[PDB]
Amino acid sequence: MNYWWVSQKQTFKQEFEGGYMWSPKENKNGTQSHYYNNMTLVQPGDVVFSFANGLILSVGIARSHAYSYNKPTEFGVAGADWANDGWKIDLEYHLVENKIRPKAHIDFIRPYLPQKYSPLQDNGNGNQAYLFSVPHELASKVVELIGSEAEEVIFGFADTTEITTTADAIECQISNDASIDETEKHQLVKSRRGQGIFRSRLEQVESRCRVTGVQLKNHLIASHIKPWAVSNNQERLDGHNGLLLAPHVDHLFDKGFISFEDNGEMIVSEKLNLDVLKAWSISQGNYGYFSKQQQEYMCYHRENVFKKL
Amino acid sequence: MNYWWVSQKQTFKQEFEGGYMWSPKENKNGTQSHYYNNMTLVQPGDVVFSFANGLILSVGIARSHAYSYNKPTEFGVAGADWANDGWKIDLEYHLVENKIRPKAHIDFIRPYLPQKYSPLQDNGNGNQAYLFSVPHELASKVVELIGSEAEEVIFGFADTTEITTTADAIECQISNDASIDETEKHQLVKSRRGQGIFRSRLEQVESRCRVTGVQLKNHLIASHIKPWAVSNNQERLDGHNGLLLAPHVDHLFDKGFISFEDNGEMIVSEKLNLDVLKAWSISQGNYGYFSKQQQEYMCYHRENVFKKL
DNA sequence: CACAG
DNA sequence: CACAG
Ligand SMILES: [Cl-]
Ligand SMILES: [Cl-]
Ligand SMILES: [Cl-]
Ligand SMILES: [Cl-]
């Protein structure tokens, strides 16, 4: 996942109200722009800090690649000098209560500014350009200054999108793989959604939500332990590579906010706000031994899915 | 009539789309602002040049005095530092095709900038403040640069409003004047709209539109020659102080785009675009002698109403 | 160049 | 001060 800084002093209200970013494809004189070319590097799930009137107003999530689109008519005079041939990105804005003023924090972030194409000068004034790459270390510092609301956009939210993208591509690869038969293709695709032979096989091993004890099939998700995307075809359909979980527990486990020790002890991520466990009446403690086959997968989950600092 | 310059780079689209001007009543620190206090001097009919992104985008007509109003919610971050307690004016925007860039013309307008509270610096850069008085000589120069569309907002349009305001006040004075009887009050008020005993008396003198020859009562306006606002009570009800005119001819005569010599020769103002007379098939020439009584009033019209350079 | 200053 | 720069 990448971080971006979009400078929107001229058109923030129009871009926010329309849920987009927009730039020309080239400078007015027809020359290439590093900044406009950055539009073509943004991926769905990338986090975009909106900077306008000296403040960071939004921690946004990109929901498209750049697509060819005319300059928005609603820019009017404020956009007069930009070419009509442009790039648009669908940006899911998340307005923040703590609108940080980066110049007021320049001593804290200066060491983390990139040597080239920095969104800020060494004195903390913004540079006049549209879209800048933000190094991960600089992004961390900005998130520290904004507080919890910035972390809430990123962890188990923005950072899930690239995983979904990867899984979508694998689903395409399976559907076109000549080495596997039609039934296998169908069962592998269903297993991604906890359906088909995977669910029936899991039901021979597990009977309830580990955490909430619910037994009712219509209130349980068939979750993989080793994620579907990184499982091989045998592991994708293995009844021992799953748990039946209530939907909120599925959410916490799938995103690595929780995991389990081999003996069933729940492990809670530092990225899980404990006020979530209180609100949903989920206790820390022991949720029963796992089988040797389940433990092999749970080891993978602890080492690769579970969120650690 | 006064001219104003409103600098709207931060909020032009919101002010244009809402048909308003807005400022705080005081600076953020509670101190008086000359610029915000200018809001309380604007009169209906005053002309306001909108300046944004270095261009004059509108020649507007004020349609209210300033009224106490909260800062528009649609300003958002762009208006964050302004106090919520403000002044609003209803401004009738007229967008111009020729968006002049004053800095590109600074040699032409510099000699006409006021010594104090100028909207422009001597180098042609704008001053950072909201609302500036524009001297009449500076306004003329700006109108010369914009062209016909600016003149069209002012002459026989914006500059009629203060006349209507004056006439409204006189109507109030008449309605409250203890020296005249109820019938007189009614007849004086009706006469302003070409109704009542004035119309009946005019119909004993005139029978047709001087210019178009229409005789049909339902297609004729009873127009004063010496305007109702500056006529005394005898002159307001005098059948010899009027003409029956087709509505377009009433428009041209009432606003002083045309007048007449005592012998009936039509006089055409330099402020009348001749393409109006062509479009409406109105010929220059002679429209019949006026009576001695009518000539006394027509002298007043030529000397005071007729538009001369 | 140039969505900030 | 500060609706531009
Ligand atoms: Cl495209
Ligand atoms: Cl620098
Ligand atoms: Cl008021
Ligand atoms: Cl100066």
Numbering used by the authors:
A (entry chain A), B (entry chain A): 1 to 309
How does the study describe this entry?
Many modification-dependent restriction endonucleases (MDREs) are fusions of a PUA superfamily modification sensor domain and a nuclease catalytic domain. EVE domains belong to the PUA superfamily, and are present in MDREs in combination with HNH nuclease domains. In all crystal structures, VcaM4I protomers have the predicted two domain architecture, with N-terminal domains of the PUA superfamily (residues 1–147), linker helices (148–178), and C-terminal HNH domains (residues 179–309).
The crystal structures of VcaM4I in complex with single- and double-stranded DNA presented here indicate that the domains may also be used for binding of modified DNA. Single-stranded DNAs are bound very similarly to the proximal strand of dsDNA. The other structures were solved by molecular replacement. Except for the weaker diffracting crystals of VcaM4I with dsDNA, the resolution of the data reached around 1.5 Å. Although crystals without DNA, with ssDNA, and with dsDNA grew in different space groups, the protein conformation was remarkably similar in all structures, with the exception of two loops in proximity of the DNA (residues 24–34 and 72–84).
